Amino acid sequence: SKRALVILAKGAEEMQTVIPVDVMRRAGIKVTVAGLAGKDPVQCSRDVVICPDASLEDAKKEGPYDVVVLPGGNLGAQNLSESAAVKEILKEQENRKGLIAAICAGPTALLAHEIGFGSKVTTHPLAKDKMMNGGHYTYSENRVEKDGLILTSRGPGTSFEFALAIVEALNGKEVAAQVKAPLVLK
Amino acid sequence: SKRALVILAKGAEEMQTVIPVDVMRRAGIKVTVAGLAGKDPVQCSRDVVICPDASLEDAKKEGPYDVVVLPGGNLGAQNLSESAAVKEILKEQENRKGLIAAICAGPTALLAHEIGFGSKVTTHPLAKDKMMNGGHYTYSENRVEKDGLILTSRGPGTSFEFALAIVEALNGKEVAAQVKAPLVLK
C-alpha cells in the first residue's frame, strides 16, 4: 500500500541500506531500491555489492513515494549530496509533505539540498560538524529523531530503530510492533 | 590476517548476511562472500540481491578459513542443509578445530550435516524444533551462544552481537571493542 524509495549510491553503508529495506518489506511497504548512478550493481562502503531494483532516473518518474530514504556512509552521502536528481526528489517530497528519512551521514544530503531547515535532527557523531555548518538545524543525540516530516538516526546500530520508526509513521504502531517481535531485538 | 567464508544461498536473510560481512571487514578480517549456487547474484529472503565475491566451488578450494559463517533465513538455511559442498566445508572446519558461526535458522544446517553434536546452541525461536530433532544439541535462549568452536545466535536483532562475537574470537576483545564503538549500538 505505502511505497518507499531507497536511494543507493556508491559508498553507501550497506547495513543502513539493507536493514531498512528488509524491515520495510516485512511491514508490507513496497520498496524500490534505486541506484543513483543507474541500475548497475552498487559497491557499498564495506564492499558488499547490491543490485538495485531500478535506476533512480526510472524510479523518480514512478513517484511519488510515501517515504524517501537516504542511507549513510560518508562516501554514499557525498554522492547523494552532489546529485541534482536527489535534490529534485527531496524538494518534491518536502513540498508534498511526505516523509524523508536519513541515517548516519545521510542527513548531510538534506543540508546540501536545503531540505527541512529549522528541524531537530541527529546524525552519526562524526557527521555532526558537517550537518551543523551554518546552523540550519538543531542537533539531537537521540538514537532516532523525528521533527515533522524529517526523520533522522545515528548509525549502523540504530538502523532497526530507524526502520521501525519509518514503519510506525507509515503503517502505525501495531504493524511496527508486529514486525519487531520476530526480529529478536534488545 | 584472519579469513572468513560467508556462504550465501538463495533465500538467506540479507540482514544476517550483510551485518556480519560488514562488521568482520571493519575488524580487518578478509571476508569471502561465496555464492552457494555460483557467482551469480543471489536473491535474499526480502528480495535484496547481493553479488557474491566468488562461487562456493571456487572459494572452498581457497581454504581453509578461520571462520565459516552460515546466515539464516529459513529458505537459505534449507539450501545450506541440502548442499554436499557445505557439508564438506563444515566437516573440514570441525576436523581442523576452526570456528563455525551460524545465526537464526542457520544452525539447522549443522544438524543436517552432523556438525558439533553435543554442543549448547541457540537459534531463532521458530527454528528450535527443527534444530532439536533427535536431541543432538542442548538449547539456549541466550542472544549469542558459544560452545567451543560452535558459535550461534538468534535473529536479525542479534546480528551485531553475533558478528562482534566472531570478531572477539578471531581478533580479540580489544579489536571488537574498537569496532563496536562507532556502530552506535545500544
Curated annotation (Swiss-Prot), chains A, B:
Q: Which SUPFAM superfamilies match?
A: Class I glutamine amidotransferase-like (SSF52317)
Task: Tell me the residues on which N6-acetyllysine occurs.
Answer: K146
| Pfam families to which the protein is assigned, alphabetical | DJ-1_PfpI (PF01965)
Modification sites for Cysteine sulfinic acid (-SO2H): C104
Effect on the protein upon substituting C51A: Strongly reduces chaperone activity and ability to eliminate hydrogen peroxide
Site positions per UniProt: Cleavage: D147, G148
Residues that the record marks as modified (Phosphotyrosine) are Y65
Membrane topology summary: Lipid-anchor
One cellular component term from this protein's GO annotations in UniProt: nucleus
Q: What is this protein called?
A: Parkinson disease protein 7
BP term (GO), one: negative regulation of endoplasmic reticulum stress-induced intrinsic apoptotic signaling pathway
What is the recorded phenotype of mutating C51S?
No effect on mitochondrial translocation neither on deglycase activity
Domain of life, per lineage: Eukaryota
On modification after translation, the UniProt record reads: Sumoylated on Lys-128 by PIAS2 or PIAS4; which is enhanced after ultraviolet irradiation and essential for cell-growth promoting activity and transforming activity. Cys-104 is easily oxidized to sulfinic acid.
Lipid (S-palmitoyl cysteine) linked to which residue positions?
A: C44, C51, C104
The beginning of the lineage is: Eukaryota, Metazoa, Chordata, Craniata, Vertebrata
